[PDB]
Design an enzyme around this catalytic site. Structure first.
Site, PDB file in Angstrom:
ATOM      1  N   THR A  73       0.826  -1.199   0.000  1.00 60.67           N
ATOM      2  CA  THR A  73       0.000   0.000   0.000  1.00 60.67           C
ATOM      3  C   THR A  73       0.863   1.254   0.000  1.00 60.67           C
ATOM      4  OG1 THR A  73      -0.166   0.177   2.412  1.00 60.67           O
ATOM      5  CG2 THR A  73      -1.762  -1.239   1.290  1.00 60.67           C
TER       6      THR A  73
ATOM      7  N   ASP B 259       6.043  -1.344  -2.118  1.00 66.68           N
ATOM      8  CA  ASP B 259       6.175  -2.176  -0.931  1.00 66.68           C
ATOM      9  C   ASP B 259       5.666  -3.579  -1.254  1.00 66.68           C
ATOM     10  OD1 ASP B 259       3.361  -0.940  -0.761  1.00 66.68           O
ATOM     11  OD2 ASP B 259       3.310  -2.486   0.792  1.00 66.68           O
TER      12      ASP B 259
ATOM     13  N   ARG C   8       3.716  -5.494   1.619  1.00 68.56           N
ATOM     14  CA  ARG C   8       2.767  -5.953   2.625  1.00 68.56           C
ATOM     15  C   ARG C   8       1.340  -5.872   2.109  1.00 68.56           C
ATOM     16  NH1 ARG C   8       3.468  -4.142   9.008  1.00 68.56           N
ATOM     17  NH2 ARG C   8       4.851  -5.857   9.625  1.00 68.56           N
TER      18      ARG C   8
ATOM     19  N   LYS D 175       3.387  -5.610  -6.726  1.00 67.95           N
ATOM     20  CA  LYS D 175       2.687  -4.358  -6.971  1.00 67.95           C
ATOM     21  C   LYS D 175       3.233  -3.594  -8.168  1.00 67.95           C
ATOM     22  CE  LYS D 175       1.473  -4.067  -2.121  1.00 67.95           C
ATOM     23  NZ  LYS D 175       2.141  -3.992  -0.795  1.00 67.95           N
TER      24      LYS D 175
ATOM     25  N   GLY E 273      -4.660  -0.198  -3.685  1.00 66.64           N
ATOM     26  CA  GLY E 273      -6.085  -0.330  -3.466  1.00 66.64           C
ATOM     27  C   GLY E 273      -6.535  -1.774  -3.543  1.00 66.64           C
TER      28      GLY E 273
ATOM     29  N   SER F 173      -1.774   3.764   0.615  1.00 67.39           N
ATOM     30  CA  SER F 173      -2.057   4.222   1.971  1.00 67.39           C
ATOM     31  C   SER F 173      -0.866   4.961   2.567  1.00 67.39           C
ATOM     32  CB  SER F 173      -2.454   3.039   2.850  1.00 67.39           C
ATOM     33  OG  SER F 173      -3.634   2.426   2.364  1.00 67.39           O
TER      34      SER F 173
ATOM     35  N   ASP G 143       3.648   3.628   7.820  1.00 70.34           N
ATOM     36  CA  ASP G 143       2.317   3.153   7.484  1.00 70.34           C
ATOM     37  C   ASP G 143       2.133   1.742   8.023  1.00 70.34           C
ATOM     38  OD1 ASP G 143       0.271   1.616   5.829  1.00 70.34           O
ATOM     39  OD2 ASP G 143      -0.095   3.646   5.104  1.00 70.34           O
TER      40      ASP G 143
ATOM     41  N   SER H 179       2.202  -1.493   4.831  1.00 71.72           N
ATOM     42  CA  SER H 179       3.300  -1.628   3.889  1.00 71.72           C
ATOM     43  C   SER H 179       4.544  -2.093   4.629  1.00 71.72           C
ATOM     44  CB  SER H 179       3.576  -0.306   3.165  1.00 71.72           C
ATOM     45  OG  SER H 179       2.462   0.088   2.382  1.00 71.72           O
TER      46      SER H 179
END
Lengths: 234, 220, 204, 232, 240, 243, 238, 250
Positions: B1, B17, B19, B33, B47, B129, B166, B169
């Site tokens: 995120t 990232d 996670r 990602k 997302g 995020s 965060d 992540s």
């Protein structure tokens, strides 16, 4: 094949409809007489073999309690139109709390008639014209009425009409023996004697279907005992 | 995120990232990602991971068809416009926020794409995020026309900041560099977080557990 | 909560080259248990099982539709399904209902048809691919199962230790959960056989 | 647009699709092409005879890829070849989208055959006037498929479509080995192409694609003429 | 047969005999002429009087398809009415989509494209009508585009469609219509149409004449009655 | 004299016994039916389309009968055959070019535009219920990494890249002129390219055309927008070639 | 999209397509139906016995409900689809009425289907003539015959397919009220009617019988053999 | 369109259907297919015509396909029609499997295919599928069972039947040499070899010219085995030996 379904003639008319009219004279003989005391319909059954049940051979059908119909031609094709006419009459009753007029029934039948083609409307439609001539006898607010529905859609209101195998000639004789002030008994007697004369075979109760519509009574079909009672005097 | 992208002197550097979490607990520590699209186009998604993956796959297929029909290399622009229109047709119901980096005939390009369909061409972009930490890192230590190593270190620091600030992540960083000449995609770029070994190992042997029924069906 | 409406628990981890996949057996409404012999692990191949968790109706429908399209593919193509292809196909199947999602989070476990390399992966209600080497878990027992696995799992496990580990994992993850359990079915896919076992779990 | 709903292709009294036979005749009258298999790959070759040099023979391409691991050539009508290759590309992309794995060449050829059959049995359309030679690599194996305008398909180790196609087939049978290398396949393909070129082949007039474990790739005129020089 | 049965097939040479027959059907009809000048575009169309029981202005071959665009037709008049309806529909769509009256060039291009689009499929037949559209603009001037049943639209200093089209063209060539005055050009149109009309061939006849231009405030209109009689008198005198 | 026909093989585009499509090959002479010849050439950095302008009558506005159409800013085109078909194809090409521009974010390459138009023509050839648009289009443009480009579609749909070609009644004669010119000279500048383009029409058709009797379009790498030469440039090139 | 009018009125209003469907019916296999006072019997010539064949799949006598059955004459495939559609109609009526189906109603809607295919676009009528046997609510035997023209008529006994006219003309003279009193006489009448059609007499023939709501069953081959022996016993003494 | 239509979905003046007649005639000269029933299984013999040495022949079978888990098919005629027919059959078989959680009965699947083929003949304006189908399978209700269907939409159940050239000769051989109820797999196989040798006497029995398939029921499981090239060679050797023995005894 080659010729289409929407093709006229050099003189300006549909030879497909002409063929339909020819199939009309290929149909069974039917007679309808309208009087001031009701209307009568009759038809020759044209029994092929004695094994065939006379019950399933009926060319006269009830459209409503006050309307009977005589069909000549593609009797298989006529029942779909008959069902449509009955459902339309019942829709009119459901909408206006009254029995549908015979003339309006005939006009709607004409609306259904001559609505066909290859690519002219929804694919689930008709391809050929109806090949059945109809006689709508009935009783409504305009007294007894009788309508000749031509497969051409040229609906007619006629006092008396004979259609089918022996349409012409027999119709002229019926007109000659027909008057403008005849009773219902006179009308049924005249129709029966003309039909008996024009019969291609020795007729009896198992060779004809008879029905009537009266101003007071509903549409009533003559059973065998009354058929014999009315035919013994003729 | 936590995904990011930047344009340096040569081309584009993308980072992400790993996670991938559903609900609130970590579901995976090795999420991909940074989706491939073309040998010169990559895109980082954040997302709804399923939506992002399907979007990237569809875009990759469409650009494959386009480039193979036209005999040319795919364009970041033709990718950005397709992403914009496709997301706008669904009115943002595709929960995908994307960072589209690539190198095309007209030069390196970086685009920020929002799920509603809005896009923007920006030299440095962050998304996800943990996007705010990486965005702050970029605003603090970004320069125009940076070298390859400087861009790599800047993106690595941005991803590290997003990871450490965060709660969605971490556990790895993925990097992908696209240039006029070379494309590198190093997934385990740097693992800033390790796991201590279990101090007391506890193992079991057959007979420690109780079994009710056995059914062997040998195969061939 | 819709995925917890009936309850569920499925897991899959890898051995040295073998695979273990296990699932709870309790089926019932949110409150009462109806059947304790429900099947939640289904064969998509000779060396490929799939576990499904979530709404029971969606589990059954997704399994049926998956077997439909899988059998059609394998009859058209002439080879046993590759686990990656199966996972991608089921993920696509779930994604096809983006606006009508099946409330199911499945996992797929098995071996390479020719390499016999262990393969395990997980999805979600939309069908997000999630390939993790160590283990994948799904169902209402997710937190318990993750906690168990992240300390009970080790790399390069023999089939017997693999079975013991996964059995302990399911037992100790469902005995602390209320909407799952009442029997555990475990499938160990080794190189040349599969072992199906029912664990002696607490039925309540 | 109305669309005829009667299939133009109809069964003759003998049952032969004489329309499909005419399509194959158009294929034969079109430019020739050859395809050949090696123990570790496939080679497709064909000639592009334009009019006088005013045509930029470099600008247009005849060998076309579908994926990184599948290419094809045609014998017949370029207008049909373009739409057919475009649809095959769409099918391969859709399969890759659905299953996240490269299209098998056999399945792609099956889809193309289904498309051709739909064309041949559907109404208002014309059967395709091309024969496709399809090279593909998947699961560490080579594949070469003949696909006819009739809609059928075959896995052929060697093939030659176009003018003098029967003689090309016989020549390939004579000069074909079971365990040849890609170099031998290229030698044989260029040998057949020069034996049936009729007009002194050139590197521009010959375009070749090779499909192996490294994928599918079209040889540029440099190595093209290099192989023609090595083969004489 | 086979090369003249539908518009979706070529002749063995590559001809469209259905379109040629449409040209015949527009040629054998009554005459219709359109003359554009520097300050206006006029139309004079010839009306066959089947019987004197008809009204003057019945079955007009002049349509007003836009606020500033006329349409002089020849050929099948029902087909011409349908094409005028299509033209005004296109003008309405352009006005709705762009906030201003459509230019005549694009109007004619779109209408000709539509006409040609109904000359491609066996499911339709080519239009049996040719038509000239005249308009005016403050920034464009007076414009006149003639359109064939095939679907070809060209700008014409002056055009004629019908039986005596070539004779009208040739005798009106003496006029330098590109910088003439609309009022006197109306009278000259009356002249040319009277000479090109064959009284022996068609003993009974009528004229429908109109213009659009700067004198109209850029909106299409019919000729005022007084100018109609004065032009009729001039044409009678020119008959000699 | 016994003008028999072989059913519908010669009537609609269906496969003939000789492996041909009769209504497709009729389009080749349908191109000739237009009675106009259009010849296009490309230089090392320029592309010039030269087309004679026919004026059958003064009574039509000859300033509004120009047959050169700008598909986009940088793409010009000219067609041969039915003029209505030419207008329809120009409209379709404009629509496809704009659609590519919106859907892909950059100007459509001329080769891809020609490929799309050729596929659209193959649609007509494949279908047996439409006239197969017996009109030929030739378009020009300036392409990065490849230079000036000229492409030409056809009702059959078989297109190709080329230095120069022509469409019309005397396309074969123009082809012969192009053969002799390419075999004689190779290095072309802008003025040499335009002079050769004029020389092609002059030699092939032998009209000694007036300045107003042609319409010429050019794309150059100085302002790649397709620009049409007016009377001044036409006369300048005419006198330059004459001297 | 396929809407070409196939069934059009030829000159004199003759449906040549209907005539050709009748020709196909005549060229098809032979079937007969008798409506006895207690039972209804169908008899089909299993022509070309072609041993090593599972006749169960080719059986031309198919039961629509517990009180309705039909035997066709004409195209086997059109017969199969019409039987499927008749199963659909019978089940739909049973659902919407929760009463036993009516033989006449079933035959009527099949006839309406045939007439829709005669009046429809891009379709040709069903080249089959059907003999529908059944029993009404009161156990009244019902025998109807419908033709591809769409006309259906109730018959005491009739025949369809090859030799249909000869068989029906024989039955109209051999049919008496007392000759159908019992199942034995009905079976013998049907067997002697089909004997003039089938060469084998007992092994290229199949018989089905339906009683008054009594789960109709197909006649056993041994019963057919012994009843052909019985009719030969009658022949030798007569 | 009236003149230029092919109107393949109408009747004929004499009541036949020329399109299905031509389809059957084309099938007659198409390849050879044979299906036979044994007390413990059902056997298929398919003949491949195009046997050029350029074939890769990597496929397990050419005209023999697997409709579903427990049913196999042999096609005769246009192979491109055969492929789309076969995958449609697989689709609908798996549809029944989904809908009922039970293997689709062979009679069910054949009836469905004959329904769709009949409708496609009935209307649509298209040329019918000129491919004959021969289906073998096992089911709960009848077990080993095989049907032959026709492009006209008519099907029949047989103990054994052949399609292709010399069909009458082949069926005569079956009627002469088939032991109903007492046909084991071995004798069935020998009869199949006899038919493959005789009904196509031109280009006498060859290993690569035909493909042989068997369908058996082992442990409640339907097993479809395609006999390999060595197996076909063994069949050829056994046929030659038995023919030599019969001739020497003669």
């Amino acid at each position: 094949y080659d010729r289409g379904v929407n093709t006229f003639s050099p003189e300006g008319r549909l030879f497909q409809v002409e063929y339909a009219i020819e199939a009309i004279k290929l149909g069974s003989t039917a007679i309808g007489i309208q009087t001031s005391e009701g209307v009568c319909l009759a038809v020759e059954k044209r029994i092929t073999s004695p094994l065939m049940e006379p019950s399933s051979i009926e060319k006269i059908v009830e459209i409503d309690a006050h309307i009977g119909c005589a069909m000549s031609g593609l009797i298989a094709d006529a029942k779909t139109l008959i069902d449509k006419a009955r459902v339309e009459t019942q829709n009119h009753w459901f909408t206006y709390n009254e029995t549908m007029t015979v003339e309006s029934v005939t006009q709607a039948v004409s609306n259904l008639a001559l609505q066909f083609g290859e690519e002219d409307a929804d694919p689930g439609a008709m391809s050929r014209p109806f090949g059945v001539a109809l006689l709508f006898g009935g009783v409504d607010e305009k007294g007894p009425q009788l309508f000749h529905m031509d497969p051409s859609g040229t609906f007619v209101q006629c006092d008396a009409r004979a259609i089918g195998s022996a349409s012409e000639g027999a119709q002229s004789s019926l007109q000659e023996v027909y008057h403008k002030s005849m009773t219902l008994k006179e009308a049924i007697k005249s129709s029966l004697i003309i039909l008996k004369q024009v019969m291609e075979e020795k007729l009896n109760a198992t060779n004809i279907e008879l029905a009537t519509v009266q101003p007071g009574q509903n549409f009533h079909m003559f059973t065998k005992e009354e058929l014999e009672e009315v035919i013994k005097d003729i | 995120t936590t995904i990011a992208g930047v344009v340096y002197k040569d081309g584009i550097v993308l980072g992400a990232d790993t996670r991938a979490t559903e609900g609130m607990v970590v579901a995976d520590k090795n999420c991909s990602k940074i989706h491939f699209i073309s040998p010169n186009i990559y895109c980082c998604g954040a997302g709804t991971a399923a939506d992002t993956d399907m979007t990237t796959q569809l875009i990759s297929s469409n650009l494959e068809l386009h480039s193979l029909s036209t005999g040319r290399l795919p364009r970041v622009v033709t990718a950005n416009r397709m992403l914009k229109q496709m997301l706008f047709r669904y009115q943002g119901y595709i929960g995908a926020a994307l960072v589209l980096g690539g190198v095309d005939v007209t030069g390196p390009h970086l685009y920020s794409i929002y799920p509603h369909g809005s896009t923007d061409k920006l030299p440095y972009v962050t998304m996800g995020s943990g996007s705010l930490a990486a965005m702050a890192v970029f605003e603090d230590k970004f320069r125009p026309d940076m070298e390859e190593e400087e861009a790599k270190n800047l993106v690595s620091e941005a991803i590290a900041a997003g990871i450490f600030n965060d709660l969605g992540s971490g556990s790895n960083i993925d990097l992908c560099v696209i240039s006029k000449n070379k494309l590198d995609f190093l997934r385990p770029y740097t693992v800033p977080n390790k796991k201590g070994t279990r101090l007391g190992r506890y193992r079991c042997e057959k007979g420690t557990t109780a079994v009710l029924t056995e059914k062997i069906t040998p195969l061939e | 909560s819709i995925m917890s409406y009936n309850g569920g628990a499925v897991m899959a981890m890898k051995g040295k080259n073998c695979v273990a996949i296990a699932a709870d057996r309790r089926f019932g409404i949110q409150a009462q248990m109806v059947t304790t012999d429900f099947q939640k692990i289904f064969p998509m191949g000779d060396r490929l099982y799939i576990g499904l968790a979530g709404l029971a109706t969606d589990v059954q429908t997704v399994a049926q539709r998956l077997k439909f399209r899988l059998n059609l593919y394998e009859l058209k193509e002439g080879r046993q399904i590759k686990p990656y292809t199966l996972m991608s196909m089921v993920a696509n199947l779930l994604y096809e209902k983006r606006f009508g999602p099946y409330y199911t989070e499945p996992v797929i476990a098995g071996l390479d048809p020719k390499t016999f390399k262990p393969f395990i992966c997980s999805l979600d209600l939309i069908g997000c691919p999630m390939v993790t080497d160590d283990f994948v878990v799904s169902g209402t027992c997710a937190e318990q199962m993750y906690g168990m696995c992240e300390s009970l799992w080790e790399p390069n496990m023999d089939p017997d230790h693999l079975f013991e580990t996964i059995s302990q994992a399911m037992l100790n993850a469902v005995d602390r959960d209320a909407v799952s359990g009442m029997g555990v079915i475990v499938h160990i896919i080794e190189k040349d056989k599969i072992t199906t076992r029912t664990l002696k779990a607490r039925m309540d | 647009e109305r669309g005829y709903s009667f299939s133009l292709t109809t069964f003759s009294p003998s049952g032969k699709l004489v329309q499909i036979e005419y399509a194959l005749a158009a294929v034969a009258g079109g430019a020739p092409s050859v395809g050949i298999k090696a123990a570790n790959g496939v080679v497709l070759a064909t000639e592009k005879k334009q009019k006088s040099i005013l045509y930029d023979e470099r600008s247009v391409h005849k060998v076309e890829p579908i994926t990184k691991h599948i290419g094809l050539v045609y014998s017949g009508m370029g207008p049909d070849y373009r739409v057919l290759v475009h649809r095959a590309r769409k099918l391969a992309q859709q399969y890759y989208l659905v299953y996240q794995e490269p299209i098998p060449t056999a399945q792609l050829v099956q889809r193309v055959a289904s498309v051709m059959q739909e064309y041949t049995q559907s109404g208002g359309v014309r059967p395709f006037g091309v024969s496709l030679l399809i090279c593909g690599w998947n699961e560490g194996r080579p594949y070469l498929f003949q696909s006819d305008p009739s809609g059928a398909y075959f896995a052929w180790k060697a093939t030659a479509m176009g003018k003098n196609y029967v003689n090309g087939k016989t020549f390939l049978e004579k000069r074909y080995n079971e365990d040849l290398e890609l170099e031998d396949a290229i030698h044989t393909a260029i040998l057949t192409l020069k034996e049936s070129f009729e007009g002194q082949m050139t590197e521009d007039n010959i375009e070749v694609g090779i499909c192996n474990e490294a994928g599918f790739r079209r040889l540029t005129p440099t190595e093209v003429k290099d192989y023609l020089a090595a083969i004489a | 047969t086979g090369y003249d049965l539908s518009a979706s097939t070529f002749s063995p040479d590559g001809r469209v005999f259905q379109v040629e027959y449409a040209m015949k059907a527009v040629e054998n009809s009554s005459t219709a002429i359109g003359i554009r000048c520097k300050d206006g575009v006029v139309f004079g169309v010839e009306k066959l009087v089947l019987s004197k029981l008809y009204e003057e202005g019945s079955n007009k071959r002049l349509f007003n398809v836009d606020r500033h665009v006329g349409m002089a037709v020849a050929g099948l008049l029902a087909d011409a009415r349908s094409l005028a309806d299509i033209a005004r529909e296109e003008a309405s769509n352009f006005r709705s989509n762009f906030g201003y009256n459509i230019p005549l060039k694009h109007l004619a291009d779109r209408v000709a494209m539509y006409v040609h689009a109904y000359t491609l499929y066996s499911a339709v037949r080519p239009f049996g009508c040719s038509f000239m559209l005249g308009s005016y603009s403050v920034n464009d001037g007076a414009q006149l585009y003639m359109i064939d049943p095939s679907g070809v639209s060209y700008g014409y200093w002056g055009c004629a469609i019908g039986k005596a089209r070539q004779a009208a063209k040739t005798e009106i060539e003496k006029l330098q219509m590109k910088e003439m005055t609309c009022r006197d050009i109306v009278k000259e149109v009356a002249k040319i149409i009277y000479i090109v009309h064959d009284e022996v061939k068609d003993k009974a006849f009528e004229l429908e004449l109109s213009w659009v231009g700067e004198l109209t405030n850029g909106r299409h209109e019919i000729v005022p009655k007084d100018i109609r009689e004065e032009a009729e008198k001039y044409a009678k005198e020119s008959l000699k | 004299s016994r003008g028999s026909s072989a059913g519908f093989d010669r009537h609609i585009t269906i496969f003939s016994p000789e492996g041909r499509l009769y209504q497709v090959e009729y389009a080749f002479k349908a191109i000739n039916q237009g009675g106009l010849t259009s010849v296009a050439v490309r230089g090392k950095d320029c592309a010039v389309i030269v087309t004679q302008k026919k004026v059958p009558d003064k009574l039509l506005d000859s300033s509004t009968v120009t047959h050169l159409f700008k598909i986009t800013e940088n793409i010009g085109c000219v067609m041969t055959g039915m003029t209505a078909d030419s207008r329809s194809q120009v409209q379709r090409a404009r629509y496809e070019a704009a659609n590519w521009k919106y859907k892909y974010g950059y100007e459509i390459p001329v080769d891809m535009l020609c490929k799309r138009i050729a596929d659209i023509s193959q649609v007509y050839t494949q279908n047996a219920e439409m006239r197969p648009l017996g009109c030929c289009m030739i378009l020009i443009g300036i392409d990065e990494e490849q230079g000036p480009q000229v492409y030409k579609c056809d009702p059959a749909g078989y297109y190709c890249g080329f230095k120069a070609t022509a469409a019309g009644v005397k396309q074969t004669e123009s082809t012969s002129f192009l053969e002799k010119k390419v075999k004689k000279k190779f290095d072309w500048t802008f003025e040499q390219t335009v002079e050769t383009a004029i020389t092609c029409l002059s030699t092939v058709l032998s009209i000694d055309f007036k300045p107003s009797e042609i319409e010429v379009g050019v794309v150059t790498v100085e302002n790649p927008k397709f620009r049409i030469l007016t009377e001044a440039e036409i006369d300048a090139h005419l006198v330059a070639l004459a001297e | 999209s396929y809407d070409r009018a196939i069934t059009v009125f030829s000159p004199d209003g003759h449906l040549f397509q209907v005539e050709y469907a009748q020709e196909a019916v005549k060229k098809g296999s032979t079937a007969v139906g008798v409506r006895g006072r207690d039972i209804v019997v169908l008899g089909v010539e299993k022509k070309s016995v072609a041993k090593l064949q599972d006749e169960r799949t080719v059986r031309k006598i198919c039961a629509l409900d517990d009180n309705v059955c039909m035997a066709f004459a004409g195209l086997t495939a059109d017969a199969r689809i019409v039987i499927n559609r008749a199963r659909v109609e019978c089940q739909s009526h049973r659902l919407t009425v929760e009463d036993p189906v009516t033989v006449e109603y079933i035959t009527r809607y099949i006839a309406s289907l045939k007439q829709r295919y005669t009046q429809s676009n891009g379709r040709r009528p069903f080249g089959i003539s059907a003999l529908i046997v059944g029993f009404d609510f009161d156990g009244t035997p019902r025998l109807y015959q419908t033709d591809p023209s769409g006309t259906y008529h109730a018959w005491k006994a009739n025949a369809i397919g090859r030799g249909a006219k000869s068989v029906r003309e024989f039955l109209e003279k051999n049919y008496t009220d007392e000759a159908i009193e019992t199942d034995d006489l009905t079976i013998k009448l049907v067997i002697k009617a089909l004997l003039e059609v089938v060469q084998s007499g007992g092994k290229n023939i199949e018989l089905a019988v339906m009683r008054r709501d009594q789960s109709l069953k197909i006649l056993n081959p041994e019963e057919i053999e012994k009843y052909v022996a019985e009719i030969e016993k009658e022949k030798e003494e007569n | 369109s009236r003149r230029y239509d092919s109107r393949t979905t109408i009747f004929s003046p004499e009541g036949r259907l020329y399109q299905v007649e031509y389809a059957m005639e084309a099938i007659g000269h198409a390849g050879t297919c044979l299906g036979i029933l044994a007390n413990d299984g059902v056997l298929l013999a398919a003949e491949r015509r195009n046997i050029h040495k350029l074939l890769d022949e990597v496929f397990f079978s050419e005209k023999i396909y697997k409709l579903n888990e427990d049913m196999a098919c042999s096609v005769a005629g246009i192979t491109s029609d055969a492929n789309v027919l076969t995958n449609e059959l697989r689709l609908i078989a798996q549809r029944y499997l989904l809908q009922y959680q039970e293997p689709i009965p062979c009679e069910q699947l054949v009836t469905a295919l004959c329904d769709i083929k009949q409708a496609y003949t009935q209307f649509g304006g298209k040329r019918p599928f000129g491919v004959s189908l021969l289906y073998i399978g096992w089911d709960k209700h009848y077990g080993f069972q095989l049907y032959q269907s026709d492009p006209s939409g008519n099907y029949g159940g047989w103990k054994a039947t052949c399609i292709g050239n010399n069909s009458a000769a082949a069926v005569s051989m079956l009627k002469q040499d088939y032991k109903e109820g007492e046909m084991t797999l071995k004798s069935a196989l020998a009869l199949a070899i006899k038919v493959l040798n005789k009904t196509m006497d031109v280009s006498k029995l060859s290993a690569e010219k035909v493909e042989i398939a068997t369908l058996t029921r082992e442990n409640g499981k339907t097993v479809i085995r395609v006999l390999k090239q060595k197996e076909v060679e063994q069949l050829i050797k056994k046929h030659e030996e038995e023919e030599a023995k019969a001739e020497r005894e003669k």
